[PDB]
Design a protein around this ligand. Structure first.
Ligand SMILES: [Zn+2]
Ligand SMILES: [Zn+2]
Ligand SMILES: [Zn+2]
Ligand SMILES: [Zn+2]
Lengths: 73, 48, 46, 67, 343, 48, 117, 48, 275
């Protein structure tokens, strides 16, 4: 079970799958069989995605932490 | 086809919370024993 | 859509199809106003 | 701020009496006289007209009022 | 209300009143503090009565027909802002209007209420699902190649969606730039607020009370001519907290209403507010103690007790009952400990 | 570090074992209603 | 709006009914009526018409909840006189009484086109 | 403390001592109205 | 039923804004039920649907639309013939019920212009609008004859909006209330002794106790009966006072006749017989 791009259904090959925000489920249009295993939500983690800092505060916190570069002086 | 769904015996339906359900009604914060008792639901308008 | 913002000083519209940085003629400030939505909106009198 | 029509207690009109109450005070400086000639008799109607300020005169004094 | 210019200010928490009526029984000390010009409520007639026993423990009973006429009708003014800042060297935000196929990451919402520029126009029935500010950003660019163009490429949907709680309408749209040098936007959401059952209220004497229940005008008692009360307070709420001053405003407001003069409420006067004020009320054609009898609104039987009626100035707290609710069956779950979100 | 996440200073003890969040719950504003029974609790329509 | 609309308080639905005929399972020969979408405006006049009639032994009315709109009527009469005729003769006496009140009301208002004095 | 926690005070306390007052005499039309308000009732009107 | 109480109507004084009458020989439940009909029962026509096309004044649209429906629209043109919108099964709105109300005003001068209810025209046929210099043909008004003022428009403010006039009554919303307040009083001497009146000397005499001038300080009467009910219906200006009673007595019998028809329908559907 590794060929899971973004759509999959055990009964028929899925094609489209929406991402509901009011419920956080993978509702399928042509049937409705969800895929299960809900991780973090895209809408709930909007402000914590990509630019998950306090307005431009890179310094990349991985090894050589240096809060400067851009907008940090 | 919501009006044409094949269902048999042994399934689980997540319907609404109808009347006659015994639910717990605590206080938060709790100070003594009789502060986490149960009650029966009753549908009524307004968020009260 | 002719609705391309409204100046806040001279109170004049621009009505141009471009991606200018909210620039306007004569007046050079950044106080931008916007028109009303042209759509059948149903209100109430209660 | 624009007194409404029909009081919240009874229902007698009073919204159209603010323009006439300000004119009676210029020629007659008496609160007990202008409130009687306007048909107001009960205490529920006197509360809506007396306890009401007209702040709309200070809002219309602005100049940027066209867009 | 707190100022005069209400169209130039765009604050996240702003509440105004439709009819800011000045209080009747007021003091001369607040005349210099600019209080009679900017009040916080109206002079609602509060009749001390038991009614049906629904105004128990910091709660009152109001009229449903009075709210329909304009009883404490406020407007919820909330302003939002989204800074259009950079995202790297060649990464930045672009205000545009993508489609369903030329972009990815639109959860489930569509762009049916947006504009070509990337914003919303004043007068659109926005809800808890639509997008108020639409914007996209890219990151891979040169990384995603080798027959990977199609139509969306790397267009990530980073639009600003409204929280599933605000069901208002856009009123004002302002676009300007700050000292940061970035062209941002600032819109305001206009919502209708009505005193529904459950909202938190207060009083000028300190006896706060939420909206217990609201009945019609026919279901409420009335006097002789037809004076229907607006707010019913618990009579037992006075001896439980020794709030004697609440009965002073309820009696002083009745005398000033029959006379037509702003009576002074100086707490250190020599006019004797016990016998002189009581004797003046009996001259107009009422009881000197201010007690009146009402009639039953269901059967028509005379009330045995005497309801002490009179106007009393109240206020309105900022505690929305529909905003403090929180309920969910099954939604987003975190990944750190497999637990729900914050709130 | 690794010890602070388990010591108790808002780690895996106080912030999870002694203070987490559950599902299926409601918290509004209570209102008096003596006409109801001793077990008939109020249930709003929006919550239901 | 979280609460019901303004028209739901009086307008019925396609699956709801007005008056409901139900019999009692306690005292012999009795019926417990049930009228939907109605407040205390109508329930107060039904008891008054049955109380004056000496052929009625018991008559009362209550509501399950004051915020809702539903009234019930439990009448108990003699074992010879059917309780269904007591409520039927009571609704006909009220209409005949209000009809005569309107007829006499139109005569008094039309007997003074100029003035009584 | 071997004592019940249910308390009946405030509005549900003054009307109790006033209903049993010596200066209280109900009429005939008010008795049948209160009998129907009972949740349960055998159906036996008491003797006046 | 054999024996029954007969009505007794004696009109005291009727005017244009209020009416006074006395009802005798009736039950106490009838006196309280007749007051609930004179308020929220009579069908009144008023503005319901509101649409704002263009607005550039100092007030928002949610404040003008609230004051538009509160205007006491007159109903002296037989409003019972209008069919409800929920029973017309047409296309939302139709000229048979919804009356088109259009507004168009523009202030180009420097001084402030007062916008009243006269600028609100109507594309509907010749139907009487609101009481604002149109019905009172007799030169005997107040001082200018007005009911409500929209907003004080200054130099550079326009106002264009559309609205319809649907059908409703007081039970649906408080804006369809043709009567302001209804007075009620019976037996000023307190014969039934429903209350106590502590020290009757402090209690003043009302305007209805003049016919029974008693000096015995509230006389007692054991064999009492609710007789002689006073009334003073005061309208707010939406309908003629003596006409509201005529339109309420006919509408009250229609509600009672519907229950009588529904009662016979349940008997035919059930296995119980009455004949
Ligand atoms: Zn599928
Ligand atoms: Zn410009
Ligand atoms: Zn009034
Ligand atoms: Zn129609």
């Amino acid at each position: 079970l590794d060929a899971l791009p973004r759509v999959t259904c055990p009964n028929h090959p899925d094609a489209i799958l929406v991402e509901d925000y009011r419920a956080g489920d993978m509702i399928c249009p042509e049937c409705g069989l969800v895929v299960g295993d809900r991780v973090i939500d895209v809408g709930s983690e909007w402000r914590t995605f990509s630019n998950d800092k306090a307005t431009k505060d890179p310094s990349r916190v991985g090894d050589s932490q240096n809060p400067l570069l851009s907008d940090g002086d | 086809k919501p009006s044409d769904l094949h269902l048999q015996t042994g399934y689980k339906v997540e319907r609404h919370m109808c009347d006659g359900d015994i639910v717990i009604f605590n206080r938060q914060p709790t100070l003594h024993k009789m502060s986490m008792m149960g009650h029966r639901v009753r549908i009524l308008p307004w968020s009260t | 859509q002719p609705m391309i913002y409204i100046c806040g000083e001279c109170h004049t519209e621009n009505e141009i199809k471009s991606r200018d940085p909210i620039r306007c003629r004569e007046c050079g400030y950044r106080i931008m106003y916007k028109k009303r939505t042209k759509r059948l909106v149903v209100f109430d009198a209660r | 701020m624009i007194i409404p029509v029909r009081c919240f207690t009874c229902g007698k009109i009073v919204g159209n009496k603010w323009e006439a109450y300000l004119g009676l005070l210029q020629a007659e400086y008496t609160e007990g006289d202008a409130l009687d000639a306007l048909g107001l008799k009960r205490y529920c109607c006197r509360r809506m007209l007396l306890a009401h300020v007209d702040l709309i005169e200070k809002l219309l004094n602005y100049a940027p009022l066209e867009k | 209300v707190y100022i005069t210019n209400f169209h130039v200010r765009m604050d996240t928490l702003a509440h105004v009143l439709y009819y800011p009526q000045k209080p009747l029984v007021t003091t001369r000390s607040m005349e210099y503090l600019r209080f009679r010009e900017l009040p916080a409520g109206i002079n609602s007639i509060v009749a001390i009565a038991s009614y049906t026993g629904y105004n128990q423990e910091d709660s009152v009973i109001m009229n449903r027909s009075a709210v329909d006429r304009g009883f404490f009708r406020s407007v919820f003014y909330r302003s939002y802002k989204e800074q259009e800042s950079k995202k790297g060297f060649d990464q930045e935000e672009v205000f545009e209007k993508p489609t369903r196929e030329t972009c990815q990451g639109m959860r489930h919402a569509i762009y049916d209420k947006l504009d070509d520029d990337g914003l919303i126009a004043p007068g659109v029935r926005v809800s808890g699902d639509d997008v108020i500010i639409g914007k996209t950003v890219t990151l891979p660019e040169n990384e995603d190649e080798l027959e990977s163009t199609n139509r969306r490429y790397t267009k990530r949907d980073c639009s600003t969606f409204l929280r599933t709680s605000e069901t208002g309408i856009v009123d004002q749209v302002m676009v300007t730039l700050n000292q940061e040098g970035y062209k941002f936007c600032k819109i305001r959401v206009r919502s209708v607020r009505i005193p529904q059952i459950g909202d938190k209220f207060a009083s000028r004497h300190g006896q706060k009370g939420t909206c217990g229940i609201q009945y019609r005008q026919e279901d409420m008692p009335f006097t002789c001519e037809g004076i229907t009360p607006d707010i019913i307070i618990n009579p037992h709420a006075i001896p439980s907290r020794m709030t004697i001053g609440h009965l002073i405003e309820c009696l002083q407001g009745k005398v000033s209403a029959n006379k037509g003069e702003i009576g002074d409420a100086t707490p250190f006067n020599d006019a004797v507010n016990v016998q002189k004020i009581s004797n003046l009320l009996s001259d107009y054609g009422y009881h000197l103690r201010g007690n009146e009898v009402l009639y039953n609104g269901f059967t028509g039987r005379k009330i045995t007790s005497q309801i002490f009626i009179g106007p009393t100035y109240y206020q309105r707290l900022k505690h929305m009952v529909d905003d403090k609710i929180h309920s969910r069956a099954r939604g987003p779950i975190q990944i750190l400990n497999r637990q729900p979100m914050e709130g | 570090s690794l010890k602070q996440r388990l010591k108790g200073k808002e780690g895996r003890v106080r912030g999870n074992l002694m203070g987490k969040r559950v599902d299926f719950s409601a918290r509004t504003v209570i209102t008096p209603d003596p006409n109801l029974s001793i077990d008939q609790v109020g249930v709003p329509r929006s919550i239901a | 709006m979280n609460a019901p609309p303004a028209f739901e308080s009086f307008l019925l639905f396609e699956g709801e009914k007005k008056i409901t005929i139900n019999k009692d399972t306690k005292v012999p020969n009795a019926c417990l009526f049930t009228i939907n979408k109605e407040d205390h405006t109508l329930g107060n006049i039904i008891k008054s018409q049955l109380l004056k009639d000496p052929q009625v032994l018991f008559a009362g009315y209550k509501v399950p909840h004051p915020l809702e709109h539903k009234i019930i009527i439990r009448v108990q009469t003699t074992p010879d006189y059917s309780p269904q005729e007591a409520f039927t003769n009571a609704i006909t006496d009220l209409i005949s009484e209000l009809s005569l009140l309107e007829e006499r009301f139109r005569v008094a208002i039309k007997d003074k086109q100029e003035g009584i004095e | 403390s071997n004592r019940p926690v249910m308390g009946i005070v405030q509005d549900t306390l003054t009307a109790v001592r006033k209903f049993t007052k010596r200066d209280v005499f109900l009429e005939r039309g008010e008795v049948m109205n209160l009998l129907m308000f009972l949740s349960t009732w055998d159906g036996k009107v008491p003797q006046p | 039923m054999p024996y029954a109480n007969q009505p007794t109507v004696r009109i005291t004084e009727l005017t244009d804004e209020n009416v006074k009458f006395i009802i005798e020989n009736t039950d106490l439940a009838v006196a309280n039920s007749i007051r609930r009909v004179f308020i929220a029962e009579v069908p009144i026509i008023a503005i319901d649907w509101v649409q704002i096309d263009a607005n550039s004044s100092v007030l928002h649209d949610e404040f003008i639309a609230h004051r538009l429906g509160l205007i006491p629209l007159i109903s002296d043109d037989i409003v019972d013939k209008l069919q409800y919108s929920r029973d017309c099964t047409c296309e939302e709105f139709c000229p048979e019920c919804s009356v088109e109300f259009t507004l168009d005003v523009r202030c180009n001068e420097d001084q402030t212009r007062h916008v009243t209810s006269r600028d609100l025209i109507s594309n509907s046929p010749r139907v009487i609008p609101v009481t604002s210099r149109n019905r009172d043909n007799d030169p005997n008004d107040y001082v200018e004859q007005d009911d409500i003022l929209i907003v004080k428009l200054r130099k550079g403010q326009e106002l264009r909006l559309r609205a319809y006039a649907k059908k409703g009554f007081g039970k649906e919303h408080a804006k369809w209330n043709p009567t302001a307040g209804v007075a009620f009083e019976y037996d000023p001497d307190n014969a039934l002794r429903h209350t106590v009146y502590p020290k009757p000397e402090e209690w003043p005499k009302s305007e209805y106790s003049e016919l029974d001038e008693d000096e015995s300080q509230a006389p007692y009467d054991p064999n009492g009966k609710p007789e002689r009910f006073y009334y003073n219906v005061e309208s707010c200006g939406s309908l003629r006072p003596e006409t509201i009673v005529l339109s309420a007595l006919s509408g009250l019998k229609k509600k009672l006749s519907d229950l009588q028809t529904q009662l016979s329908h349940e008997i035919q559907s059930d296995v119980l017989t009455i004949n």
